[PDB]
Design a binder for this molecule. Sequence first.
Ligand SMILES: [K+]
Ligand SMILES: [K+]
Ligand SMILES: [K+]
Ligand SMILES: [K+]
Ligand SMILES: [K+]
Ligand SMILES: [K+]
Ligand SMILES: [Mg+2]
Ligand SMILES: [Mg+2]
Ligand SMILES: [Mg+2]
Ligand SMILES: [Mg+2]
Ligand SMILES: [Mg+2]
Ligand SMILES: [Mg+2]
Ligand SMILES: [Mg+2]
Ligand SMILES: [Mg+2]
Ligand SMILES: [Mg+2]
Ligand SMILES: [Mg+2]
Ligand SMILES: [Mg+2]
Ligand SMILES: [Mg+2]
Ligand SMILES: [Mg+2]
Ligand SMILES: [Mg+2]
Ligand SMILES: [Mg+2]
Ligand SMILES: [Mg+2]
Ligand SMILES: [Mg+2]
Ligand SMILES: [Mg+2]
Ligand SMILES: [Mg+2]
Ligand SMILES: [Mg+2]
Ligand SMILES: [Mg+2]
Ligand SMILES: [Mg+2]
Ligand SMILES: [Mg+2]
Ligand SMILES: [Mg+2]
Ligand SMILES: [Mg+2]
Ligand SMILES: [Mg+2]
Ligand SMILES: [Mg+2]
Ligand SMILES: [Mg+2]
Ligand SMILES: [Mg+2]
Ligand SMILES: [Mg+2]
Ligand SMILES: [Mg+2]
Ligand SMILES: [Mg+2]
Ligand SMILES: [Mg+2]
Ligand SMILES: [Mg+2]
Ligand SMILES: [Mg+2]
Ligand SMILES: [Mg+2]
Ligand SMILES: [Mg+2]
Ligand SMILES: [Mg+2]
Ligand SMILES: [Mg+2]
Ligand SMILES: [Mg+2]
Ligand SMILES: [Mg+2]
Ligand SMILES: [Mg+2]
Ligand SMILES: [Mg+2]
Ligand SMILES: [Mg+2]
Ligand SMILES: [Mg+2]
Ligand SMILES: [Mg+2]
Ligand SMILES: [Mg+2]
Ligand SMILES: [Mg+2]
Ligand SMILES: [Mg+2]
Ligand SMILES: [Mg+2]
Ligand SMILES: [Mg+2]
Ligand SMILES: [Mg+2]
Ligand SMILES: [Mg+2]
Ligand SMILES: [Mg+2]
Ligand SMILES: [Mg+2]
Ligand SMILES: [Mg+2]
Ligand SMILES: [Mg+2]
Ligand SMILES: [Mg+2]
Ligand SMILES: [Mg+2]
Ligand SMILES: [Mg+2]
Ligand SMILES: [Mg+2]
Ligand SMILES: [Mg+2]
Ligand SMILES: [Mg+2]
Ligand SMILES: [Mg+2]
Ligand SMILES: [Mg+2]
Ligand SMILES: [Mg+2]
Ligand SMILES: [Mg+2]
Ligand SMILES: [Mg+2]
Ligand SMILES: [Mg+2]
Ligand SMILES: [Mg+2]
Ligand SMILES: [Mg+2]
Ligand SMILES: [Mg+2]
Ligand SMILES: [Mg+2]
Ligand SMILES: [Mg+2]
Ligand SMILES: [Mg+2]
Ligand SMILES: [Mg+2]
Ligand SMILES: [Mg+2]
Ligand SMILES: [Mg+2]
Ligand SMILES: [Mg+2]
Ligand SMILES: [Mg+2]
Ligand SMILES: [Mg+2]
Ligand SMILES: [Mg+2]
Ligand SMILES: [Mg+2]
Ligand SMILES: [Mg+2]
Ligand SMILES: [Mg+2]
Ligand SMILES: [Mg+2]
Ligand SMILES: [Mg+2]
Ligand SMILES: [Mg+2]
Ligand SMILES: [Mg+2]
Ligand SMILES: [Mg+2]
Ligand SMILES: [Mg+2]
Ligand SMILES: [Mg+2]
Ligand SMILES: [Mg+2]
Ligand SMILES: [Mg+2]
Ligand SMILES: [Mg+2]
Ligand SMILES: [Mg+2]
Ligand SMILES: [Mg+2]
Ligand SMILES: [Mg+2]
Ligand SMILES: [Mg+2]
Ligand SMILES: [Mg+2]
Ligand SMILES: [Mg+2]
Ligand SMILES: [Mg+2]
Ligand SMILES: [Mg+2]
Ligand SMILES: [Mg+2]
Ligand SMILES: [Mg+2]
Ligand SMILES: [Mg+2]
Ligand SMILES: [Mg+2]
Ligand SMILES: [Mg+2]
Ligand SMILES: [Mg+2]
Ligand SMILES: [Mg+2]
Ligand SMILES: [Mg+2]
Ligand SMILES: [Mg+2]
Ligand SMILES: [Mg+2]
Ligand SMILES: [Mg+2]
Ligand SMILES: [Mg+2]
Ligand SMILES: [Mg+2]
Ligand SMILES: [Mg+2]
Ligand SMILES: [Mg+2]
Ligand SMILES: [Mg+2]
Ligand SMILES: [Mg+2]
Ligand SMILES: [Mg+2]
Ligand SMILES: [Zn+2]
Lengths: 37, 5, 174, 140, 204
Amino acid sequence: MKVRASVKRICDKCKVIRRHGRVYVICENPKHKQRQG
Amino acid sequence: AAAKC
Amino acid sequence: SRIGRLPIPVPKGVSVEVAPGRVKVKGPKGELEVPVSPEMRVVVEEGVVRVERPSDERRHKSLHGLTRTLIANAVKGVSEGYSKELLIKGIGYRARLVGRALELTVGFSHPVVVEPPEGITFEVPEPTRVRVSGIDKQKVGQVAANIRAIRKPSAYHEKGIYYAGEPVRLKPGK
Amino acid sequence: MKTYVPKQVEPRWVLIDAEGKTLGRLATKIATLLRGKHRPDWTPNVAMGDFVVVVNADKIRVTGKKLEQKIYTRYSGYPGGLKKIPLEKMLATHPERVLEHAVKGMLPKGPLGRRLFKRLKVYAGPDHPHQAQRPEKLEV
Amino acid sequence: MKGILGVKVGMTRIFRDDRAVPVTVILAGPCPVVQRRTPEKDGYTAVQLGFLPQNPKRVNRPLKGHFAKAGVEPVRILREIRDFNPEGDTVTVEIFKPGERVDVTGTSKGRGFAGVMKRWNFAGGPDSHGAHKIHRHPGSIGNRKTPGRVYKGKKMAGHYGAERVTVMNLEVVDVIPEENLLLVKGAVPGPNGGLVIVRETKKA
RNA sequence: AAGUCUGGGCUAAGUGGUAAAGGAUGUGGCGCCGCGAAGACAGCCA
RNA sequence: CGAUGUCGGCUCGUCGCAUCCUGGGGCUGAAGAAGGUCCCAAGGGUUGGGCUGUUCGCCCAUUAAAGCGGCACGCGAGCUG
RNA sequence: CGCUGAAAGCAUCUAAGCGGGAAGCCCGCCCCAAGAUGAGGCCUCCCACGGCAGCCGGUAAGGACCCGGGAAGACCA
Ligand SMILES: [K+]
Ligand SMILES: [K+]
Ligand SMILES: [K+]
Ligand SMILES: [K+]
Ligand SMILES: [K+]
Ligand SMILES: [K+]
Ligand SMILES: [Mg+2]
Ligand SMILES: [Mg+2]
Ligand SMILES: [Mg+2]
Ligand SMILES: [Mg+2]
Ligand SMILES: [Mg+2]
Ligand SMILES: [Mg+2]
Ligand SMILES: [Mg+2]
Ligand SMILES: [Mg+2]
Ligand SMILES: [Mg+2]
Ligand SMILES: [Mg+2]
Ligand SMILES: [Mg+2]
Ligand SMILES: [Mg+2]
Ligand SMILES: [Mg+2]
Ligand SMILES: [Mg+2]
Ligand SMILES: [Mg+2]
Ligand SMILES: [Mg+2]
Ligand SMILES: [Mg+2]
Ligand SMILES: [Mg+2]
Ligand SMILES: [Mg+2]
Ligand SMILES: [Mg+2]
Ligand SMILES: [Mg+2]
Ligand SMILES: [Mg+2]
Ligand SMILES: [Mg+2]
Ligand SMILES: [Mg+2]
Ligand SMILES: [Mg+2]
Ligand SMILES: [Mg+2]
Ligand SMILES: [Mg+2]
Ligand SMILES: [Mg+2]
Ligand SMILES: [Mg+2]
Ligand SMILES: [Mg+2]
Ligand SMILES: [Mg+2]
Ligand SMILES: [Mg+2]
Ligand SMILES: [Mg+2]
Ligand SMILES: [Mg+2]
Ligand SMILES: [Mg+2]
Ligand SMILES: [Mg+2]
Ligand SMILES: [Mg+2]
Ligand SMILES: [Mg+2]
Ligand SMILES: [Mg+2]
Ligand SMILES: [Mg+2]
Ligand SMILES: [Mg+2]
Ligand SMILES: [Mg+2]
Ligand SMILES: [Mg+2]
Ligand SMILES: [Mg+2]
Ligand SMILES: [Mg+2]
Ligand SMILES: [Mg+2]
Ligand SMILES: [Mg+2]
Ligand SMILES: [Mg+2]
Ligand SMILES: [Mg+2]
Ligand SMILES: [Mg+2]
Ligand SMILES: [Mg+2]
Ligand SMILES: [Mg+2]
Ligand SMILES: [Mg+2]
Ligand SMILES: [Mg+2]
Ligand SMILES: [Mg+2]
Ligand SMILES: [Mg+2]
Ligand SMILES: [Mg+2]
Ligand SMILES: [Mg+2]
Ligand SMILES: [Mg+2]
Ligand SMILES: [Mg+2]
Ligand SMILES: [Mg+2]
Ligand SMILES: [Mg+2]
Ligand SMILES: [Mg+2]
Ligand SMILES: [Mg+2]
Ligand SMILES: [Mg+2]
Ligand SMILES: [Mg+2]
Ligand SMILES: [Mg+2]
Ligand SMILES: [Mg+2]
Ligand SMILES: [Mg+2]
Ligand SMILES: [Mg+2]
Ligand SMILES: [Mg+2]
Ligand SMILES: [Mg+2]
Ligand SMILES: [Mg+2]
Ligand SMILES: [Mg+2]
Ligand SMILES: [Mg+2]
Ligand SMILES: [Mg+2]
Ligand SMILES: [Mg+2]
Ligand SMILES: [Mg+2]
Ligand SMILES: [Mg+2]
Ligand SMILES: [Mg+2]
Ligand SMILES: [Mg+2]
Ligand SMILES: [Mg+2]
Ligand SMILES: [Mg+2]
Ligand SMILES: [Mg+2]
Ligand SMILES: [Mg+2]
Ligand SMILES: [Mg+2]
Ligand SMILES: [Mg+2]
Ligand SMILES: [Mg+2]
Ligand SMILES: [Mg+2]
Ligand SMILES: [Mg+2]
Ligand SMILES: [Mg+2]
Ligand SMILES: [Mg+2]
Ligand SMILES: [Mg+2]
Ligand SMILES: [Mg+2]
Ligand SMILES: [Mg+2]
Ligand SMILES: [Mg+2]
Ligand SMILES: [Mg+2]
Ligand SMILES: [Mg+2]
Ligand SMILES: [Mg+2]
Ligand SMILES: [Mg+2]
Ligand SMILES: [Mg+2]
Ligand SMILES: [Mg+2]
Ligand SMILES: [Mg+2]
Ligand SMILES: [Mg+2]
Ligand SMILES: [Mg+2]
Ligand SMILES: [Mg+2]
Ligand SMILES: [Mg+2]
Ligand SMILES: [Mg+2]
Ligand SMILES: [Mg+2]
Ligand SMILES: [Mg+2]
Ligand SMILES: [Mg+2]
Ligand SMILES: [Mg+2]
Ligand SMILES: [Mg+2]
Ligand SMILES: [Mg+2]
Ligand SMILES: [Mg+2]
Ligand SMILES: [Mg+2]
Ligand SMILES: [Mg+2]
Ligand SMILES: [Mg+2]
Ligand SMILES: [Mg+2]
Ligand SMILES: [Mg+2]
Ligand SMILES: [Mg+2]
Ligand SMILES: [Zn+2]
């Protein structure tokens, strides 16, 4: 998981979701997982 | 207290 | 392009009685209770069950899709049933069946035994194949996930407990 | 001429059911009754309100996410002595304290306000032990 | 959950499997049942036990009527064992077998007004190198203007001991029903002759 | 002390009730364009 | 300024978390073992000695680790000087 | 980290709902504790004396003073 203030889609398979008041980026590539924090 | 300088 | 507008082609042997906030489904396999939001109307007609929504804003469009699929899952469950198949891979790893409980030999220093919950049945056709069966789709998925969490698939080897149809993705280790 | 001063009067016993009421909006009405401000002869320096009996206090209703977010705090006077209790835990363990705490904060501070709090009787469940006083049911 | 009242007799050691075992001897039996506490009447379950029989000329009327209701001779000590309901009207040392673990409660010896070095194991001050009349003193008790006060529970000199103390998970070494004697491994609070309570341990 | 006043709308964060660059399928409202039974976006066989 | 005693040591603590150890996790250029990096986490713990008035730092022998800060750079109507 | 699942025919740990998960949190263990003035509860004992929500005496159940002491203790307790 990458935790940073600037979360963005890194590749065309990246997906942006919102669960429990937080923005997440989830992707098939495990390196692309992100949390806004 | 003592020397305060 | 919708989910909640399609009626449910209920087959015979399955009886659904609507109730305030609930939908009671009875079939040859068992009975299920499906709590439905009172903010919506469920109506049962000849061989069909259809759900309508009372407005067109975001919340009612969201519950319309949710309400139909859960009911359709319940009606399907009591007619045909639900199952999930687990694969056990690795040279020494295998499974067997103790009475009703299931036995896992997955490379720990001890065996791992799982007691099935009420409404769930286990099947071991092969030592490297486990089936979980029941009438509740949510419980079938949950129990299957519980067993898979005992020994998750490895990231470097084709070893562990896998879902049926789950692809195997490895990385080099040398 | 001088303003009318009432003489002492036997007080009224009142019964309130808290089933499904919003906590804060019920507590306001209780505090007004305890102060006796519904009486044309109200006097600020005497205790002349009603005795209030509340039943079904455990079935009070709260809006939003206050069940998990509202925190009661107690300070013991020791280092690290601040204790925090969420509302849902208070409802489970001491249901009567929730409505008691809300009303107490809405009463005047001082000796008279402390006496007025003594005239409130809160019970979880539908029964109360004050049948001798015969409280008349009031709709809130 | 089961218990009995007793008196600390003394300390010795015995030999077992070529090992020396330090033991405390306790005279425990017998304890007549005087009153039973029930949830219907009292709100909890307990049994009130009696110990150390007393000369009737020293028993006043309220206690004599209390003893007469149970049909027992007057004793000196009345104590409750929480969550215990003995089968009979008398409790003896037989309730315990060797190898069982027990908790023992007593009143520790009283040290009176004790200093911080004895009561709290404070380091004290130096004994040379200019130290001026502060050898057994506590040192600083606070900070400056913030917070400008001393915390509650600050460790200071005061009364020490003569208080209730429980030692847990002591092994029962031997039971001697002829002389109503119980042998436990190790040390027990209080002086010889002091009242103690022996209960089944809460550990596991 | 005096409206749990009346009418229309928004917020779900206890935001209201203590902060920036930056980030985001939060939500409501309006627009500009494109492709649409010269059968479109998604799903499915290629 | 008709006075608010100033370094270090000692004694006695208590608090914060931007966490040194111990507990739980994601990612890894993670085979395993050992690491790296970020997230959660302040319950408990965080050694003895040589040099110097020293704080600091270096060094010796260890350790799971030898955390960083606040409290009038905490504490002289408590000591030292 | 999940199960089921819409809005968004796919998908999604979430919007409805349901699980797993820390030396941390709440109980649990030990100690204090009804001045908890919201002053709680249970067992037993004493009784309706006299003279006129109070006043003056003599008593009951009990208690205190005094004395011998105490691994209790500055005194007190
Ligand atoms: K916007
Ligand atoms: K000055
Ligand atoms: K400190
Ligand atoms: K890690
Ligand atoms: K800590
Ligand atoms: K230096
Ligand atoms: Mg960045
Ligand atoms: Mg008044
Ligand atoms: Mg009043
Ligand atoms: Mg509310
Ligand atoms: Mg709530
Ligand atoms: Mg603290
Ligand atoms: Mg704190
Ligand atoms: Mg504390
Ligand atoms: Mg007792
Ligand atoms: Mg003793
Ligand atoms: Mg004792
Ligand atoms: Mg003693
Ligand atoms: Mg003494
Ligand atoms: Mg001392
Ligand atoms: Mg000592
Ligand atoms: Mg001493
Ligand atoms: Mg000493
Ligand atoms: Mg000590
Ligand atoms: Mg102590
Ligand atoms: Mg100590
Ligand atoms: Mg020392
Ligand atoms: Mg000292
Ligand atoms: Mg010192
Ligand atoms: Mg010393
Ligand atoms: Mg000396
Ligand atoms: Mg010197
Ligand atoms: Mg010196
Ligand atoms: Mg010295
Ligand atoms: Mg000296
Ligand atoms: Mg000197
Ligand atoms: Mg000194
Ligand atoms: Mg001195
Ligand atoms: Mg000296
Ligand atoms: Mg000394
Ligand atoms: Mg001192
Ligand atoms: Mg201190
Ligand atoms: Mg100072
Ligand atoms: Mg000062
Ligand atoms: Mg202060
Ligand atoms: Mg202090
Ligand atoms: Mg303290
Ligand atoms: Mg303390
Ligand atoms: Mg102390
Ligand atoms: Mg002291
Ligand atoms: Mg003392
Ligand atoms: Mg209004
Ligand atoms: Mg807003
Ligand atoms: Mg927020
Ligand atoms: Mg905010
Ligand atoms: Mg707020
Ligand atoms: Mg705010
Ligand atoms: Mg002066
Ligand atoms: Mg002055
Ligand atoms: Mg000055
Ligand atoms: Mg001064
Ligand atoms: Mg100085
Ligand atoms: Mg200094
Ligand atoms: Mg120094
Ligand atoms: Mg210093
Ligand atoms: Mg120092
Ligand atoms: Mg020091
Ligand atoms: Mg030292
Ligand atoms: Mg210091
Ligand atoms: Mg120290
Ligand atoms: Mg000190
Ligand atoms: Mg210290
Ligand atoms: Mg600290
Ligand atoms: Mg942190
Ligand atoms: Mg760690
Ligand atoms: Mg860790
Ligand atoms: Mg490894
Ligand atoms: Mg991270
Ligand atoms: Mg993280
Ligand atoms: Mg972190
Ligand atoms: Mg933390
Ligand atoms: Mg902290
Ligand atoms: Mg913290
Ligand atoms: Mg050393
Ligand atoms: Mg050192
Ligand atoms: Mg040395
Ligand atoms: Mg050094
Ligand atoms: Mg040297
Ligand atoms: Mg040397
Ligand atoms: Mg040195
Ligand atoms: Mg140095
Ligand atoms: Mg030197
Ligand atoms: Mg250096
Ligand atoms: Mg070394
Ligand atoms: Mg070293
Ligand atoms: Mg080591
Ligand atoms: Mg500061
Ligand atoms: Mg400062
Ligand atoms: Mg300074
Ligand atoms: Mg300093
Ligand atoms: Mg300092
Ligand atoms: Mg200082
Ligand atoms: Mg200092
Ligand atoms: Mg100091
Ligand atoms: Mg100082
Ligand atoms: Mg000095
Ligand atoms: Mg100094
Ligand atoms: Mg000072
Ligand atoms: Mg001073
Ligand atoms: Mg001073
Ligand atoms: Mg010095
Ligand atoms: Mg000096
Ligand atoms: Mg000098
Ligand atoms: Mg000198
Ligand atoms: Mg939800
Ligand atoms: Mg925590
Ligand atoms: Mg824990
Ligand atoms: Mg108390
Ligand atoms: Mg008590
Ligand atoms: Mg008193
Ligand atoms: Mg108090
Ligand atoms: Mg009392
Ligand atoms: Mg005296
Ligand atoms: Mg004396
Ligand atoms: Mg005395
Ligand atoms: Mg005393
Ligand atoms: Mg006395
Ligand atoms: Zn990606």
